[PDB]
Symmetry: D2
């Protein structure tokens, strides 16, 4: 029977979420996009305007099958959690049912139980400051949006998931080793994410027979990556120069691994940080 | 010349902070206690009442030399950050200059530049819930109080520290491996703490020639440990049964290591998680 | 089209080698078995008699496509390494082209370049002794047969492998955490093997565009697992009781991850220790 | 009172062994040098002539207290292991009681039980070759001399050591991350050695109440470091440029950590790889 995957964190076609959606489509997985409200209408415009048609090609006979595309904000757990300021926002005022709980309800109401969950989102409002100059509000924002949001996602989605479902998120090696430009408590958020992945694997594994893993991806010139002050170009030039595999890293490279982790093929893997980065993580120094 | 250590996180004599204060005293380090406001007066009462006199004995000729004891709340960065509710609290209303910045100023005003800093505090208001049932507010509290507080401590204290100063904090292996009762995002807070320790080592090391490390201690029946629902007794019974070293773990065991890390003897060590837990971390399973 | 895999280390159908063969067979990969001479003829007689006929049942009717079965000894790099006594041993006198180089040469002659390599073998004379009690000779035996053998397979098989080829081995968590009973220097060999996997990922990735990883498998009741003093019953019981995923771990659970890592889907993963143990490695203590 | 340390691996004053001896000497520990026979006599002639007289200067006048200097070869476990050719080699014919057991026996006879043990030696015939190019013999050479030797020292010295004694060795980060140039299987040996340190911490902690750890030292221009193909100049330059702590790493920086780990102050630490490299290990890439 059909499998359904909710992917939280799609803003365009240039990030890992799209890559994952693409590769799942090779396997005939029905895709639901969770899109952050501020960029939801523009995404919808581009999509309707056919801007993504070329990017939706799987191959000769296949074309990405997107079930639905919904507004999703990981800043908010339930309806009660939205503040008046966001309520009164140009971009949000015209949308509804976009809190993490509302989306689970809405999906379940529309299409029943799902069996695949992808957390592909991060945010840190002080990413451009180093850790030592990051404010408490800044740091807790990184953690709220980039780490707590995985926990909330699970808390609310497990009700609408079949036994033997699988969940993945995306991390970065800044958590384990210093990467000077990865500021604002983003390194910290990733660190908590990778540990939470373990603690969750235990809970979800024991209570629901549901698996959860995280992919530590190498650099990709995505929207958010360009936001960091360029960082991402140095990162890519460095990976391509010194990684064991001197080949350009594509989002569908992470996509194919995500697909495997999300399938019954990896029935015995849970609680892991899997490195999909051309082996760059294994190097001590430039050679 | 004299060395001064600020220890943040002393509530009684039964935790790691006291252990560290004791061992630093063997080396004639002047100790300043940072004490959380809610328990400051009771600590002061006990101290004046002589309740701690036996616990202050170093040995035949030495007696812990406590320079000062100040109210300290890691919840608050500066004066501006205190809310009206805490302002209007029985325990705080009668105290002042207890925010992280105020304490650095106050210490520096009183005794000049210090050269040793100890973060020995944690808190998580939902520690009794597992990760999956922890609320966003709960989780961010763990992180604010247990992890951001190290960053803030450094941001503000480096101004009042000599070159070649050293800083330590305390972590727990729950960050790296699942420990089912360590709830409320405490595992997450520790994970972020250990990663932050690295990122900070880079910044402080390069800019100020200041070192920072963290000690992953094994279980000790402390005030906060008894708070966890008992957990701590199982933990201790287990460590004593299966650790490589079948010997009771004492706070001064962590104390002696802290003393070494805080001294010039470990001039070449920074950014590390050091395990002071009778080797328990090396075991896969009960033997 | 025309994927060929050499699986080094199969004596019967109760191992992880068998499980890897079955899952690869499912993707229509051509299987070549490398078989240690002590057990080769009993394996062939068993095979011809159709004792494995039941074990080759894949799903609804599909049967294993074993392309060849070759005598193989990972002890010997080249014909010139073989000592006179082994050459004339009862079980070896009747066999040829069983050294690492010779099986490389052989495979190439009969089938051309292959693109998949599985190191699925370990040995140690003194596995029953704990590390402290292991002789220099028995430790070097363990390293030689269990660790050097991977380096040697690589040096020789890289010649007969197409660019973008993939290589896996199997490891155990005793290299990272203490597991009493895993003696003879087998933990040392797994440690070395997990570290050689990184060093090799570098050389092979840069010079040949070939990937190599290692699977850290959970416990399985194979022939060799029993030769360890029982140990394995305890291991399996511990695992089924305490793992996040309380299911029986099957050889085909490993096989499908092996399959994935050998395929182009894992193009961006190299140098890695991938855990396939139902998440047991993430646990600190039992509950 | 009456601490005795056997330091295995000193040829001159340019190593980490020298640095360990100097720092131990500062705490009034009695030093016994174990000296590889190829360099023993040139070391003695040098010593008697007072070539090391300058190097024994500690602080304001204090000089090293070398209690003994013994020929020692970690290749040989017992007299019966020594091959006829080595026995009659020019440099060995004039020496006795140089195997591991014999130096144990010897030390015990002349001084009684000791309480500190330093493994400060490595070797590999084919260090100049990369892993892929290393022969079976040269790999086993590396493991034998660099890794087995620690297990063997332990098995024999535990007999002549008091409860609560301590044991250190030296390792390098090439076991965990790829370092081209660190060939011959030296990375494999360090991997094995860091894993054997855990296994040994278990046995020795439980059966003898003895601790063992390992220091992962940063680069130092010792005799052996130069024998590696230059490699070390590059290593030191990289390290001084990119480490969190941009200071020159001295042998005595290692020595004072060794001292700490051998003393009772580290009573609760066992099984650990302690990094002494100015924090370089925490770095992902240069800046
Ligand atoms: N791009 C890289 O180099 C790289 C390397 C390692 C890991 N990652 C991880 O991969 C994931 C995907 O990011 P990306 O690199 O593809 O960039 P991206 O911009 O394509 O993805 C990030 C998405 O998160 C969404 N988002 C931001 N705040 C949100 C909120 N409050 N609620 C819901 N959604 C929100 C944004 O709309 C954006 O589309 C990220 O979590 C990132 O940490 C990326
Ligand atoms: N006790 C253990 O078993 C154990 C094991 C590993 C690590 N640790 C760590 O050691 C450290 C010391 O704790 P402990 O175990 O000695 O218990 P403890 O209760 O003695 O120490 C915790 C202290 O933190 C203080 N504190 C709480 N909230 C604060 C705030 N907002 N601002 C300032 N101070 C605050 C409390 O007053 C308390 O005295 C903790 O960080 C803990 O995580 C403890
Ligand atoms: N069985 C487990 O529970 C388990 C758990 C983790 C890892 N592993 C790993 O899996 C591998 C073994 O698989 P298994 O557990 O099914 O045991 P197994 O006995 O089924 O497989 C090992 C095979 O290797 C062959 N072999 C031994 N020495 C050889 C040599 N010198 N040259 C060629 N072949 C040789 C043997 O004939 C044997 O059939 C080992 O690397 C082991 O470390 C096994
Ligand atoms: N030098 C560095 O930069 C560095 C960095 C990390 C680790 N280490 C470790 O330190 C140790 C060596 O110290 P070093 O770097 O000062 O080199 P070194 O040459 O000064 O010390 C090694 C000594 O071991 C002795 N030795 C060699 N084979 C022996 C045997 N079979 N029996 C007894 N003794 C033997 C040699 O005589 C030599 O003096 C090694 O374990 C090495 O891995 C060194
Ligand atoms: O090159 C490494 C890299 C680049 C981008 C990443 O994603 C983000 C980074 C920061 C922020 Cl604020 C948001 C996101 Cl989605 C990331 O995790 C790692
Ligand atoms: O036995 C392990 C253990 C016990 C206590 C600990 O400290 C705390 C734990 C939770 C909270 Cl809310 C506060 C503190 Cl100080 C800890 O870190 C680990
Ligand atoms: O339970 C875990 C386990 C069981 C078996 C294993 O394989 C071997 C273990 C020792 C020897 Cl000599 C040979 C082999 Cl194939 C192993 O690696 C781990
Ligand atoms: O720069 C890092 C470095 C330098 C020297 C080292 O020691 C050796 C290295 C190889 C051999 Cl054969 C012997 C020894 Cl003592 C080492 O371990 C690491």
């Amino acid at each position: 029977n059909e499998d359904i995957c909710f992917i939280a964190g799609i803003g365009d076609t240039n990030g890992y979420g799209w890559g994952i959606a693409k590769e799942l489509s090779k396997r005939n997985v029905k895709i639901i996009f969770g899109i952050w409200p501020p960029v939801y209408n523009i995404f919808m415009k581009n999509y309707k305007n056919g801007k993504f048609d070329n990017d939706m090609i799987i191959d000769k006979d296949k074309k990405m099958n997107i079930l639905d595309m919904l507004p999703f904000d990981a800043s908010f757990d339930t309806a009660n959690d939205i503040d008046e300021e966001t309520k009164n926002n140009k971009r949000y005022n015209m949308l509804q049912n976009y809190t993490i709980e509302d989306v689970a309800n809405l999906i379940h109401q529309k299409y029943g139980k799902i069996n695949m969950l992808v957390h592909s989102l991060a945010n840190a409002k002080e990413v451009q400051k180093d850790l030592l100059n990051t404010s408490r509000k800044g740091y807790l924002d990184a953690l709220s949006k980039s780490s707590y949001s995985l926990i909330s996602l699970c808390k609310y989605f497990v009700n609408i998931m079949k036994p033997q479902s699988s969940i993945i998120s995306l991390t970065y090696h800044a958590s384990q080793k210093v990467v000077p430009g990865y500021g604002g408590g983003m390194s910290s958020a990733k660190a908590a994410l990778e540990s939470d992945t373990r603690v969750l694997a235990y809970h979800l594994g024991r209570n629901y027979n549901i698996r959860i893993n995280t992919i530590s991806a190498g650099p990709l010139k995505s929207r958010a990556a360009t936001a960091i002050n360029t960082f991402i170009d140095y990162m890519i030039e460095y990976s391509e120069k010194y990684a064991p595999l001197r080949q350009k890293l594509l989002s569908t490279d992470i996509g194919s691994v995500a697909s495997f982790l999300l399938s019954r093929e990896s029935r015995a893997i849970t609680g892991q940080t899997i490195y999909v980065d051309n082996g760059l993580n294994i190097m001590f120094l430039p050679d």
